[PDB]
Structure 1
């Protein structure tokens, strides 16, 4: 393979992380909520730009107990995506807190992408596209694991922002 990119997902417990990763890693979705414990990661080899990229996507467990040790894996993060579910409530209250942590612990040049997940959950949609998308314009940076939409392109985008930092 040609290169190796190491991404990390950060978020609160109940927003979609292990399911966004699972929909991309294996093109699937499952309803049961199995809380992630500590840390995990999966490997996905992709064929962007003829450069064969190996992805190492790290999955965080966003459960207050763990917030010590998961900090550990921040420095190595090259690219990041932060978990936002359209229907989820006051998971935004803590965004600054996580972003504090990235400023506090990650490498300075780490990329940051923000996702809207579960966008099939329109009925309980609490948060417009631009509700947070204006925040996205604020820092210069939607998907459904259930319906598997814009998930693949979401990750390949982060590959874009990293591999362009390469040259």
Structure 2
């Protein structure tokens, strides 16, 4: 029985950036335990409803280690929506967002849905990346952008639901 769709999503980005909390907040875990640190992969499921239908989201969170290079391509290649995630507390994370965009373009599929996620927007006092400058990156590359906080719990649920709507609207187009 239910669900009645399966979107496969991916979280990618620099380490430190809080990819993994951003997940843990969406999937609603009561706990901190993860294998990201040690292994470099972790995974979470959440079904949501959008305009009435069940939508199973499988969310992979990748951390680059070259150790599992092959497997993590498999995730790129098979991913329906991927979130690029920087820390607004840290520039190079933001600078690299271009670099990742490479990978995504190079390792991943030709129509994938894409979303730049400016994380930790919660801590303004340690802000190095202007939002304005954040949006411009996004607009340049014609992709959606969103500022977030895994800890204040800001826009994480919205970031996903937004990406999930974007995936579905595309698929419903191929009726």
Normalising to structure 2: TM-score of the pair? 0.85
**Alignment partner of 2:89 out of 74, 87, 90:** 87
Between the two proteins, the alignment pairs up a number of residues equal to 166
Q: 1:140 deviation in Å?
A: 1.8
Q: 1:160 deviation in Å?
A: 1.0
The whole-number CA distance in structure 1 between the counterparts of 2:85 and 2:101 is: 12
More strand by share: 2
Find the counterpart in structure 1 of residue 51 from structure 2. Answer: 49
Unmatched 5+ stretches in structure 1: none
Q: 1:38 deviation in Å?
A: 3.2
The whole-number CA distance in structure 1 between the counterparts of 2:94 and 2:141 is: 15
Find the counterpart in structure 1 of residue 129 from structure 2. Answer: 127
**Alignment partner of 2:165 out of 139, 160, 163:** 160
Find the counterpart in structure 1 of residue 141 from structure 2. Answer: 139
Q: Which has the higher contact order (CA 8 A, sep 6+)?
A: 1
Q: 1:72 to 1:36 in 2, by over 3 A?
A: farther
RMSD: 2.2
* Aligned partners of 1:13 and 1:63 also within 8 Å: no
Deviation string, structure 1 residues 65-88 (Cα, Å, up to 9, x no partner): 555652232110100100111102
Structure 1 consecutive aligned stretches of length 4 or more whose deviation exceeds 4 Å: 27-30, 63-69
**Alignment partner of 1:71 out of 54, 70, 73:** 73
Unmatched 5+ stretches in structure 2: none
Secondary structure at the residue paired with 1:82?
strand
- Could you tell which deviates more after superposition, 38-47 or 150-159? 38-47
The whole-number CA distance in structure 2 between the counterparts of 1:147 and 1:28 is: 15
* Aligned partners of 1:18 and 1:36 also within 8 Å: no
* Aligned partners of 1:38 and 1:70 also within 8 Å: no
Normalising to structure 1: TM-score of the pair? 0.89
